[PDB]
Design a binder for this molecule. Structure first.
Ligand SMILES: Nc1ncnc2c1ncn2[C@@H]1O[C@H](COP(=O)(O)OP(=O)(O)OP(=O)(O)O)[C@@H](O)[C@H]1O
Ligand SMILES: [Mn+2]
Ligand SMILES: [Mn+2]
Lengths: 708, 242
């Protein structure tokens, strides 16, 4: 052990007394009961480091002696070192900032609460629901698996974080009413803040609190879609999206390495947007200025002015991690400004400014790969290179290679060497498999559609997220907000595609029975954002499935906007991206919480929106589809020999689009079918809204595609 | 300052809204075909001398549009939900009407064109074109001596007309006297600039609306002799302290 690993693991276990109190195993408070748990665990297996780490959960007279009894020489630590490690972690616990039956209340809707369960994307979707007390049994079953895992863990921050994440994710860090913060997040943030204070070179201070000894480090990529899309195949396009992820990780892990920090210091890293808490020593800002420049120079040489990385940082004090009358949002706002300016000075860190086959193999070797190894660039097996490291694909049979191993969609290392640092990375990587073992193609997906053979595209984004995050008070609140948000796209979109959460989703607009292996391929999904292609009819339905899943996942408190596209399978990817983009930021431009279902004619009188409110379209489908649509590409049959009355309404709606004030569409109008459309709706004219006829095309045009 | 607006009334649709390099490129070619390469040399001399052309911008009726200066981007804070959503729609706007351009230069409150008088239709077969609204089109600004306008720019534009016809009027932009200026042209910067958007063609160009501090840009001659226009068309711009 050295002081730096002790201060990390220190703040990372300070409040592990909470789960053991709430189990009722010892007879004390969390600080006392936490001390007993780790000492009892230390003796079991026989690793004395846990008895060193038990001092954190607790005039200074008694404590100096309890430190002395644990001979500090043993772990190559000074007595005076450990005393700071303790005091440092004590301050950290306060900056990241009552029954014992209370559950974790949802950061999205603090009115609703999470049922006690362990983070597993395979089983069930976390839905904030009715407030239920968690039994002291569930906490005991928790504390034992938790005890069994710490027994086998290698006692580095990267082996401890994952097991604290798996079990303590759905636990209230404090058992107050409307408590928003996951315990794991409070633990990783105290470890982050504590280690930052250490590197800042401050000790025995009660100084670091009211002096700018910290750094907020927000890194943001500009022109992500100008990098991923705008290509000359899907296998490739996925490796583009996958290559962007490794580049970002190569930069983050480099920052953590050179500043001497741990993954706990990563507040978030999703959608190519990463934040890091760190020391404000000059060596740090020098090490930062070195990295930022060497990274940009690599990006320029490798891709020209297509992909830029805007990295900025602000000197921040302990005050500004907390609220006084909201300083934390204020510190993030001043930093977002530093970024906006750096994004208007793209490649300004180059003075010489004003004077890939590897992805195909990566795209081909993509189905059976567990992760990648972060080695030096010149090393055997290196398939792709980032600015700072070569990346070695890690396959089911082979050994991993390198200082860091990046492993996909698990929080358990598996069989990786004891010395190798474990880096869990989650990604929404669903894809329909071919007759061949490889991922499907635009052609095959398009062929597998009900009716018309178009490729389906949807670009989806969360409405007013920036506002939601700037309303967070403390680092730990942002951490829970960040992680839960990111895990919906990176974790659960996979399950939502598979056909899970049937009861939570319910009856959505649909054309066929939901398949077992759906014709869907995820391109990008992470940090409030997703791009997904597949059979148009399966893509159309998934839009409503994802919107409902998200409605339930949030407390009906956050909304999506989605743009849908139904394209000729031969249309190039860059043209598809611009149209769904055009359709997405239209759906946002026409208000938010709405979907661009299909392209449409309309009056340009500024009273007629192309986009539909999710609830508006869902009502229209429920109303009209069942009268005219039987399912699986077949009509009601009363309609057989009358597929013509539907086309006639689309022509009647067109003479409402010619002029909505001309009362001829009343003249033109079995007639039972659609009685809502024959009358000249009056409240609509009073309220200054479109006539019912204007809206129906959204349903009919989708049915007529399914039936052709 | 007061300038000559060269109005291009289109006789059909356009492929590009041309920017300063391609405008000079076209005028350079026309003057070769009319007066030989002695006239091209006299034109480069006038331009290296202090004469400037802007990039082409849209006009609709008696409404001239100009490029949104990148100066306002970091100053947009100068409600909660009213703020974010507008601040993005401003950040996406690529043009302002003359009146709101002159306000944006002085960091006073301004507003956006609700309709831009052109749309990029891209018919499949695939390549694209630009459809102009009624009595709408594209124009560019000339600053410098009248004798250079009459004897080079005017003849060249008429020759290039023969897809459009050409008429020109006097136009005035009020701009703050300042250390800092916007370019109404895409430029090859000599000094490193203040605020900018890169623009790849192979040359690395500063975009229209970029902010420079006393940068005249420069011309580049090369062999394939051809001159490449990258001179700044500066108007003084008030900057926010950041
Ligand atoms: N999981 C996440 N954790 C942290 N930051 C995130 C996460 N997801 C997205 N972000 C960041 O939050 C910001 C919000 O981006 P975006 O513009 O898409 O949302 P917004 O502010 O709600 O705007 P709009 O509603 O107009 O789309 C971006 O800086 C983005 O990178
Ligand atoms: Mn968003
Ligand atoms: Mn986004």
């Amino acid at each position: 052990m050295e002081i730096d690993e002790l201060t990390a693991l220190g703040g990372l276990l300070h409040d592990i007394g909470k789960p053991v109190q709430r189990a009722g195993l010892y007879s004390g408070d969390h600080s006392t009961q936490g001390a007993r748990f780790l000492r009892d665990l230390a003796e079991n297996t026989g690793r004395a480091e846990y008895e060193l780490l038990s001092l954190f959960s607790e005039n200074d007279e008694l404590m100096i002696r309890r430190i002395k009894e644990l001979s500090p020489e043993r772990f190559g630590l000074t007595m005076e070192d450990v005393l700071n490690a303790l005091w440092i972690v004590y301050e950290a616990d306060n900056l990241a900032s009552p029954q014992a039956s209370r559950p974790l209340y949802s950061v999205f809707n603090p009115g609703k609460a999470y049922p006690w369960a362990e983070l597993d994307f395979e089983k069930e979707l976390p839905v904030p629901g009715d407030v239920f007390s968690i039994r002291s049994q569930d906490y005991r079953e928790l504390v034992k698996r938790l005890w069994e895992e710490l027994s086998k863990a290698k006692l580095r921050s990267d082996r401890l974080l994952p097991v604290l994440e798996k079990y303590l994710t759905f636990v209230s860090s404090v058992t107050s009413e409307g408590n928003i913060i996951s315990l794991y997040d409070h633990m990783r943030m105290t470890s982050a803040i504590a280690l930052a204070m250490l590197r800042a070179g401050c000790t025995a201070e009660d100084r670091c609190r009211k002096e700018k000894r910290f750094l907020l480090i927000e890194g943001d990529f500009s022109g992500i879609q100008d990098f991923i899309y705008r290509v000359s195949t899907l296998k490739y396009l996925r490796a583009r999206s996958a290559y962007l992820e490794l580049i970002g990780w190569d930069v983050v892990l480099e920052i953590l390495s050179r500043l001497g920090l741990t993954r706990a210091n990563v507040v978030f890293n999703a959608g190519g947007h990463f934040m890091i808490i760190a020391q404000n020593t000059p060596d740090a800002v020098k090490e930062l200025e070195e990295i930022r420049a060497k990274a940009v120079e690599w990006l320029y040489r490798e891709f020209e002015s297509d992909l830029y990385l805007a990295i900025e940082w602000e000197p921040v004090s302990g005050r500004e991690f907390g609220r006084e009358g909201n300083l934390f949002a204020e510190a993030r706002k001043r930093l977002k400004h530093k970024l906006t300016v750096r994004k208007l000075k793209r490649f300004g860190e180059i003075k010489g400014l004003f004077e890939c086959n590897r992805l195909v193999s990566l795209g081909g070797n993509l189905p059976k790969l567990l992760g990648f190894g972060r080695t030096a660039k010149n090393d055997a097996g290196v398939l792709v290179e980032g600015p700072f490291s070569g990346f070695v694909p890690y396959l089911q049979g082979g050994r991993p290679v390198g200082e860091q191993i990046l492993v996909k969609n698990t929080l358990n290392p598996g069989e990786i060497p004891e010395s190798a640092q474990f880096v869990p990375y989650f990604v929404a990587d669903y894809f329909k498999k071919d007759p061949k073992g490889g991922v499907a193609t635009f052609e095959e997906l398009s062929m597998a559609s009900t009716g018309t053979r178009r490729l389906g595209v949807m670009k989806g984004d969360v409405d007013r997220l920036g506002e939601f995050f700037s309303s967070m008070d403390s680092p730990s609140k942002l951490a829970t907000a960040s992680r839960f948000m990111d895990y919906f796209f990176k974790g659960y979109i996979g399950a939502i595609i598979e056909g899970k959460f049937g009861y939570i989703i319910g009856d959505v607009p649909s054309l066929r029975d939901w398949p077992e292996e759906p014709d869907i391929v995820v391109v990008y999904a992470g940090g409030d954002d997703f791009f997904i292609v597949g059979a148009w009819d399966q893509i159309f339905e998934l839009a409503f499935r994802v919107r409902r899943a998200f409605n339930a996942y949030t407390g009906g408190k956050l909304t999506l906007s989605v743009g849908l596209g139904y394209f000729d399978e031969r249309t190039p990817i860059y043209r598809m991206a611009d149209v769904v983009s055009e359709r997405l930021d239209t759906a946002k431009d026409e208000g938010r919480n709405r979907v661009f279902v299909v392209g449409r004619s309309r009056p340009l009188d500024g009273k007629h929106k192309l986009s539909y409110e999710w609830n508006h379209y869902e009502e229209l489908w429920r109303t009209y589809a069942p009268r005219i649509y039987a399912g699986n590409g077949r009509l009601k049959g009363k309609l057989e020999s009358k597929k013509g009355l539907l086309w006639k309404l689309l022509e009647i709606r067109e003479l409402y689009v010619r002029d909505p004030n001309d009362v001829r569409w009343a003249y033109l109008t079995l007639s039972d079918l659609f009685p809502e459309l024959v009358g000249i709706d009056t409240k609509a004219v009073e309220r200054k809204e479109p006539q019912p006829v204007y809206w129906v095309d959204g349903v009919l045009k989708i049915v007529l595609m399914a039936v052709r | 300052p007061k300038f000559i607006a060269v109005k291009l009334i289109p006789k059909g649709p356009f492929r590009d809204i041309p920017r300063a390099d391609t405008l000079f490129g076209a005028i350079g070619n026309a003057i070769s075909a009319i007066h030989g390469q002695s006239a091209v040399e006299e034109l480069v001399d006038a331009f290296v001398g202090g004469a400037r052309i802007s990039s082409a911008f849209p006009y609709s009726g008696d409404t001239y549009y100009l490029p949104k200066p990148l100066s306002v981007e970091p100053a947009l804070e100068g409600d909660e939900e009213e703020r974010y959503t507008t601040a993005k729609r401003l950040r996406k706007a690529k043009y302002l009407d003359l009146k709101n351009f002159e306000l944006a230069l002085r960091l006073r409150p301004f507003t956006i064109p609700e309709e831009i008088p052109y749309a990029r239709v891209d018919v499949p077969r695939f390549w694209e074109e630009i459809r102009f609204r009624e009595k709408s089109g594209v124009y560019f600004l000339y600053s410098g001596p009248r004798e250079v306008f009459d004897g080079y720019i005017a003849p060249a534009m008429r020759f290039l007309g023969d897809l459009f016809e050409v008429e020109f009027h006097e136009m005035k932009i009020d701009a703050p006297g300042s250390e800092y200026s916007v370019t109404l042209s895409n430029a090859l910067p000599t000094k490193t600039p203040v605020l900018w958007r890169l623009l790849r063609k192979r040359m690395t160009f500063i975009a229209e609306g970029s902010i420079v501090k006393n940068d005249p840009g420069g011309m580049e001659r090369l062999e394939l002799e051809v001159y490449v226009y990258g001179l700044t068309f500066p108007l003084g711009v008030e900057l926010p302290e950041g």
